[PDB]
From a paper:
Guanosine triphosphate (GTP) cyclohydrolase I (GCH1) (EC:3.5.4.16) catalyzes the conversion of GTP to dihydroneopterin triphosphate (H2NTP). This reaction is the first and rate-limiting step involved in the de novo synthesis of tetrahydrobiopterin (BH4). The effects of GFRP on GCH1 occur via formation of heteromeric protein complexes between GCH1 and GFRP, which are dependent on the intracellular concentrations of the effector molecules phenylalanine or BH4. GCH1−GFRP complexes consist of one GCH1 decamer flanked by two pentameric GFRP complexes.
Numbering used by the authors:
A (entry chain D), B (entry chain D), D (entry chain E), F (entry chain A), H (entry chain A), J (entry chain E): 58 to 217, 222 to 249
C (entry chain C), I (entry chain C): 57 to 217, 222 to 249
E (entry chain B), G (entry chain B): 57 to 116, 125 to 218, 223 to 249
The structure:
């Protein structure tokens, strides 16, 4: 994964590229709000991709056991902020996670941490959705997991708004349609 | 102003800077969705700053005369999409324009064209608001003009949403408070 | 003279002929199933959208009911309005909010709606339609004041990529007394 | 397809017909507001039918490939503006697209260009709905596609608002009712 | 004298006879199942809609503004005999005399259940409260949907009567109009 | 059907009956506000029952189109204004029509004319709902048709508000419950 | 036999006497201005809230599902004598017999204006409709806010009675529950 | 004030009166649902009037803070549940309190206890509003205080819904209209 | 044994002592005006937030009203719930939706609310609070089935940067019959 | 200010006190769910009061300069999460900031950092409101500043929701009532 040493070393390279963009756009990088912009844009881009620094394995250290709880757990409206890999323009929305545990439940804070690791990268919504559902499956080994991501893509909102919904259903969520209906009803 | 010849000439320079950013972020620019990204991001950035190509003077050729109309004209909820100059991150919202004419009214399409010229640039919301109000004042010479811009800045929404409202009041809109009250009530 | 049904009957084939020419000039086949009756359908639709030319404001004015001892503000809000943009021939639809302070003369609700219909069903500019409604009421009732607010969505710019246009005409006490104007704008919300 | 040479050549024909329409309606085409109307209404009509200039095959040449993703992708609330072919009066609304890919996904911007090519023509809502569904099927070869179009027809809004809903279901969207239920729930 | 139950009994066959004539004049068959009891049902409905004629208003340091908003109102248009329904918002500044909430609602019912003009219904309620309490001021706002124009293709008519301090002090009027929202 | 000759001949009869009603209610028909009421009420009642003048048979010509579409078409929120046949008091609301065509479609304006023909009469909501559904079935011969009418009855709103919903399901709408579920979901 | 106006006249002083005792037992002064007429006013209000006892239900190819939703309901909790207000949604599939809208509302009024349990009020209305029309099925849904627990710090209690085809056919029940939304 | 000893002693008296009410209404007090009702109603009525047990004077200690703030403090949407003194029927709603302090502030919990003391009694909304405003004035000696109570009276909602708004303005709230406007705007 | 008022009186100074230590460990001055009574105020607030320990589910169960001939679903939705996160000692507030199909035994509305209060006023995990409410109702009424849905906002993650947590326990016919479960989830909306 | 060395040193003290609180409340600190709670509640409390670690002077070193802009800037709906200093229970809401600059504007991210430094401390809403207003005044030296804070206090939400509104007006916001009216209208 990416490190703080890498970030320190690559910051002047990113600032050099951002200053070249300011020049190529027909702007004077030696003006009022454009003086510190090569560095500010570089630091913003490093923050938007800080998920590369994290590994899902080290975060996973919280699979708390449940006593006789064979019931569906849902965490809806988790704020998600990601970067489109095709155009390098943000896409912002919400993630709705649902699962049927098998003696192990994940902490609420840790569920939102999985969303953060994957969303803070150059992404495609379809991949971010599957990554979140696969991490949960591998962390808890549940009966099933359902992930629904609804986001507004700026790369087409700035072009002339429409929401993109992607859903990954695994285990009992994809096989039992009565379980899937319950999940989709409860996330409303 | 910027030209299509300039855009053709600077596109490979922008693509060279975007590919360097992909490399500096810890990504392989020779992969699936990252192959055409240096060019796609460069073309998106040229589109987001296409207002530099336009001049407010050539657009201004539509000051249609009015017969005995000394009444307030408002065009509210004009979609506005701009780029923050400090971080190079979008900021998206609406512009509400209002004016009291002096024998000359501007076409609705031309009012939204003023918003487009100024918004499609590296901006500060405060400047974009004043630029829109000054262009209208210089185009129509009215009794007064009021511009209210409400936008969501991604450079702070991606950091953890809050709307930023900036308002420029000129002429009778800044002097007569009864006129200003009417405008702010009608834009709701 | 206003437009008549005899004029409409006589000009319908001329409008259909022009619409058939438009279909061809746009690169369409006017002989295809869906376009066969279109020159006539578009012509009849355009005649309906401009039927306000057939009406006269003076002849609609016939019953100004004498509700004397009424020195209080009357408002008719959310009157549906459908008009045609005179610059591009594209619709613009919205609502008209009318308000007035009578001078021992009130106008019937149906007659206020007929004023909106006469002026809106024409090739218009929102600013003119607003003033025309306001002036018609002033001339019909001779009130203390009248306020007209028109909020409409112009398709000629919504089809180009979405913004309400608000125009307001204040006459008499509505124009002069700001406390009267504040009451009107609050009540139309 | 229609070209810019065709548009330049047919503009005076359209302006001549529009001038005739102003006269046939009982208007004075020499009055201030109507002077440039034959040309303005001609250029507006050319813009409303600019989809004739575009070809679907040339636009559909950029389909992204994603493996192990047999999950439903939805793009809802896509703004749509079309022309009624029976009366030449607009009909505006939203398009909701949904599909189950077969190792091939379409870019969000390209989905919006399919809606634009077909909607910017003299249409019937039923045809526009099928055209979009077919364009997606041809571009991706997916398991199934669903298109729902909700529009307000100015023909029966200017006559005294009622929404018209048309839906085209293809492949697994048509056959599996559990897939169709999920799509219709998610577009709400 | 106000209308009585003796008059309602005596005039019911007259109203039923007129409604029988209306069904025929409209091109309907008054002998069909759904129209058989209609001359009597319409007559009794019209008597109920105008039952306010039977009633008489004469029968029906804590000085702070009192407001009773969203009082349901159902009246009949006197020009076309078509209903108009809405809400009444009443406000007043007392002078050591307040009115019961049920009695304020009875004033609205007495005047609304008659052949009306919205402007008159608004003034009649404001005058009744002024005469009952002798307050510093009273404000009445009526917002109604007239079916005689909604059935013709079109939403709300607002009429307001301001008396006393409500009419004179604009700061009092602003407070009232803000609070009824 | 009723004619304009009949309306001219019966207007004084209706005015005579309305004048008698004013007297029977204890009003003075000579007062300013009631003088023209016998004629105004008579003309209003003739307008509310103008559907008697129209014939359903004279509406099918130059209305039925040919689609080649087996997909569901819905026209929701059609404003409906009718008169209660029991008390002669209005009942106003919305009609939602849906159908699965069989190589025959119906123009949107003609669907609205079916609602107007039947609603502008002395009605019972149950009958108005069935009459619309039968008219569409006879005009198009479709796979199925569904009609839902939701109206507020003034004859009980004036007595102390409550919406009445009546639904007629024919063909595949009546038999296939999965089709009926889709229709009822889409009209929301 | 049902309650009569003779019983309302005879029992009013008994109820007023009991309400006089309640004011004193609560620690109030029944002679203060606001409480003077309260023993009689509370007694008459309680008689009105239970006026359904006076009424008797026995007195009060177009076979498609008919629904009357959002019928206003105002009842009294029989456990604590505290009101509970809400809405009744009625639905039925007729068998060549339909009921007038006003008569459906009168069924709700007869049973709601009594000392009730929501579960019973729901079943009584469903049974009355079944006995009046003999339909294919009937569905009654009552959603009410109980003041006896809202005044204690807490929003809606939903009770549903499904009879005939509404109980048996789940596709019919789904349609009804969808349409009442 | 009323005590727990008084409540214990008067509970059988209230139960006796409630049993008499059940009989006077034509009910059988021996039926299952009514058996414990004389005691349940008695305990409910004692709870609804528990404000008699409290004293306003015993609430000011360990409650008044010292701020050095001359800015307006507002506590809106305080749930209020009271009993009509004319009919013994509840009236429920919200209290909105506002004040301009004079070097003396009041704890949020103690403001809510003032509302509870006065509301839990046989009341008239006008009195409850003034009693709260006077209690705050006497506790803090502020520049001004404003109390707005909006409640639904069941004694008229059960008769056929309508909100009653009462407002008491004291000090600068009564005198300065610009202060009163700010308060009424902020409580919305 | 459950917690008592004698226990609360005895442990209040111990809780106040611990809270005073927390103020110091956080870098605050416990002698400043606003913090003087805080060790006692926080201690009393924490005792109130955990007052459910003082209650017993068996003793609250005393009136299972015999509403026989009721083979229909009873729902009590939007019951306000306020609880304490056992992991971080931070509140989590929301609503509880309860539903059940009785077997000639119904529970009073007030008693259903008392079950929610007993379990919620403790150091909890939403999953446990949901199952505890469900099991208490099953044991009190022996019904055909019971459904409990709890939707709450956890401050321990809203204060960290905003998401509702929904937990549902389905027992008996609610768990087995999917048509019953669909009806319950539709009616709680 | 507080440091990371202080946090490391005081964590076992806080954990020891939290372990004592679990015992004093009648809980078994050895049960699964409570085992790591002394440390988790200690770290949560340290996060809720991390504003003590920050200094306002070090953050306020980046104020942008804009000339000829004497127009009002507003940042509304800034999420705020604070701790009640009387009971140590959270209070969450929104901050609405407004100001009239004097050739000096503050970055949107820096306005949000002022809210964070002061809100992440044991507070009283009245103080937090004044602190933010003062921090802006000191950083920009503007014509005037307005701060409105709306929060829900868990002290009186867990006890039986009412919002608390506090407003601090400085400079022209305090003196000119027409400026104050505009600000309060725009934050709605
Ligand atoms: Zn993109
Ligand atoms: Zn920025
Ligand atoms: Zn135009
Ligand atoms: Zn058409
Ligand atoms: Zn009328
Ligand atoms: Zn009727
Ligand atoms: Zn009760
Ligand atoms: Zn009362
Ligand atoms: Zn936690
Ligand atoms: Zn507190």
């Amino acid at each position: 994964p990416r490190s703080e040493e890498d970030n320190e070393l690559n910051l002047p390279n990113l600032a050099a590229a951002y200053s070249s963009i300011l020049s190529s756009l027909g702007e004077n990088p030696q003006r009022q709000g454009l003086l510190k912009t090569p560095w500010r844009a570089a630091s913003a881009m490093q923050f938007f991709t800080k998920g590369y620094q994290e590994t899902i394995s080290d975060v996973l250290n919280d699979a708390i056991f449940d006593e006789d709880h064979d019931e569906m757990v849902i965490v809806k409206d988790i704020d998600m902020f990601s970067m489109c890999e095709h155009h390098l323009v943000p896409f912002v929305g919400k993630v709705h996670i649902g699962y049927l545990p098998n003696k192990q439940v994940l902490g609420l804070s840790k569920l939102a941490r999985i969303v953060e690791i994957y969303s803070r990268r150059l992404q495609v919504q379809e991949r971010l959705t599957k990554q979140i559902a696969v991490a949960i499956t591998e962390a808890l080994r549940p009966a099933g997991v359902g992930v629904v991501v609804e986001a507004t893509h700026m790369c087409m909102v700035m072009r002339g708004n429409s929401k993109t919904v992607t859903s990954t259903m695994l285990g009992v969520f994809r096989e039992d349609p009565k379980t899937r209906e319950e999940f989709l009803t409860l996330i409303r």
